[PDB]
Amino acid sequence: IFLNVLEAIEPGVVCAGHDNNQPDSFAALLSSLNELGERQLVHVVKWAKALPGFRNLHVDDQMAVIQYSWMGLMVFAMGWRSFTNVNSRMLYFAPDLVFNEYRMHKSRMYSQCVRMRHLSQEFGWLQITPQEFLCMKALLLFSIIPVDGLKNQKFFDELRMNYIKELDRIIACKRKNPTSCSRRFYQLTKLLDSVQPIARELHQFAFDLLIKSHMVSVDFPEMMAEIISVQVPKILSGKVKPIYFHT
Ligand SMILES: O=C1[C@@H]2[C@H]3CC[C@H](CC3)[C@@H]2C(=O)N1c1ccc([N+](=O)[O-])c2ccccc12
């Protein structure tokens, strides 16, 4: 019933509202991205709260976990959309905001976009199924926490353990073949680990942009601006860190 729940709660299409009549400029692109980011955050919150066992977490931990993993979750899902929509050729942030190389450059996030596009390609190189994608995204929500722990660490550890086992099942079920399916699990865990460094570059870029937004003329929605100035700094200063499968 796990996979059914994931498929049932999976967010739908989310547009950015980008004016594709305009010629493209740093401000216009980033202003649309920030608006889309706020929109996606709202959907990620609803998605997370409807995940199996998620309400078992302390109230403060629930939001904490969502805010810390928000960027990684967006990276992962967007990498998936790009793979299934345009074969990783471009970055499908939204139906009305697709990034070609010109916008990657004009947005001033080229290196970050290069990393993300590489991630999207991995979905194809590894032949990731829709089901593995859903389970991995779920596990991604439980992959970053304060080094000093959450208000109720034990509950988080139990929930994380259960999602790892669900991923292990979706791999074991009629699909594999050999005796040691440590290979498919190994690469999927490696792929999830690869999201963290990308999220970190996006975190850094988001932080730097918010600090100088006043000049660059870029609006930051209320919720996104609070996460970037309250949550993000904690990740950048080393207080909250990703949980890596491999060292
Ligand atoms: O939120 C932000 C802005 C904040 C502030 C500056 C930029 C990165 C983070 C801007 C931005 O690009 N984004 C992003 C917006 C929307 C998506 N998405 O749903 O496709 C994103 C997916 C991956 C990475 C970032 C996404």
Side-chain angles (χ1 to χ4, degrees), residues 1-173 176 178-246:
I1 83 172
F2 189 67
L3 291 311
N4 280 181
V5 172
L6 266 14
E7 305 185 288
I9 66 173
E10 181 68 357
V13 175
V14 185
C15 297
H18 182 252
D19 350 63
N20 289 97
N21 69 85
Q22 299 303 69
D24 277 352
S25 75
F26 176 69
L29 262 22
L30 270 297
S31 292
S32 289
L33 282 172
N34 290 177
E35 174 60 18
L36 175 59
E38 184 91 318
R39 298 182 170 193
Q40 211 74 59
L41 176 63
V42 173
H43 282 77
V44 172
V45 170
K46 302 174 189 299
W47 168 76
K49 293 174 184 295
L51 282 167
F54 187 81
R55 291 168 62 71
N56 287 175
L57 296 178
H58 183 90
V59 194
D60 299 307
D61 297 330
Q62 300 182 198
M63 281 303 303
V65 152
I66 285 172
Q67 299 178 306
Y68 295 142
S69 71
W70 167 59
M71 191 60 72
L73 287 173
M74 289 206 297
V75 172
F76 203 60
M78 194 270 283
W80 179 252
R81 284 200 298 288
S82 299
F83 163 60
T84 73
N85 289 170
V86 298
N87 280 175
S88 308
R89 283 167 41 65
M90 303 173 280
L91 300 181
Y92 204 98
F93 287 93
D96 65 322
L97 190 64
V98 179
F99 268 43
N100 42 39
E101 289 234 353
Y102 181 67
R103 280 117 86 75
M104 286 182 198
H105 179 271
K106 299 296 279 67
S107 66
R108 294 174 193 178
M109 292 192 291
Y110 200 83
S111 64
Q112 283 90 181
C113 291
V114 175
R115 311 281 268 99
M116 298 188 274
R117 192 175 61 200
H118 180 81
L119 168 52
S120 342
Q121 296 178 76
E122 283 278 37
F123 284 115
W125 293 328
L126 293 176
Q127 295 181 308
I128 291 174
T129 66
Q131 294 67 53
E132 294 176 316
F133 164 68
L134 294 179
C135 292
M136 286 189 276
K137 188 158 57 58
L139 186 56
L140 243 192
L141 169 67
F142 307 110
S143 307
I144 181 166
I145 59 176
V147 66
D148 89 320
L150 292 161
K151 295 183 182 184
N152 198 313
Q153 257 305 308
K154 273 186 176 173
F155 290 180
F156 177 84
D157 293 342
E158 167 65 12
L159 198 57
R160 173 184 172 70
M161 162 172 85
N162 286 167
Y163 276 83
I164 287 174
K165 305 309 167 296
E166 292 299 349
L167 173 56
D168 198 54
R169 291 184 189 177
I170 202 65
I171 293 176
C173 297
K176 300 298 84 62
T179 173
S180 182
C181 63
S182 305
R183 164 271 208 68
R184 220 304 194 279
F185 183 79
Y186 174 78
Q187 43 192 54
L188 290 189
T189 51
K190 260 294 197 299
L191 175 64
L192 279 183
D193 276 36
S194 72
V195 178
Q196 297 313 337
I198 298 165
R200 167 85 184 202
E201 299 302 4
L202 286 170
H203 279 146
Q204 187 61 249
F205 176 93
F207 177 81
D208 287 332
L209 187 49
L210 174 60
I211 299 303
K212 66 184 178 179
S213 65
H214 316 82
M215 183 295 119
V216 295
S217 314
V218 173
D219 297 312
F220 276 79
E222 165 186 54
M223 285 172 70
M224 191 183 106
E226 187 207 82
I227 282 174
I228 297 174
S229 56
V230 173
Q231 266 65 231
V232 171
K234 292 179 178 186
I235 294 179
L236 302 178
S237 66
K239 289 191 185 181
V240 31
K241 295 195 285 67
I243 296 173
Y244 287 98
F245 275 104
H246 307 83

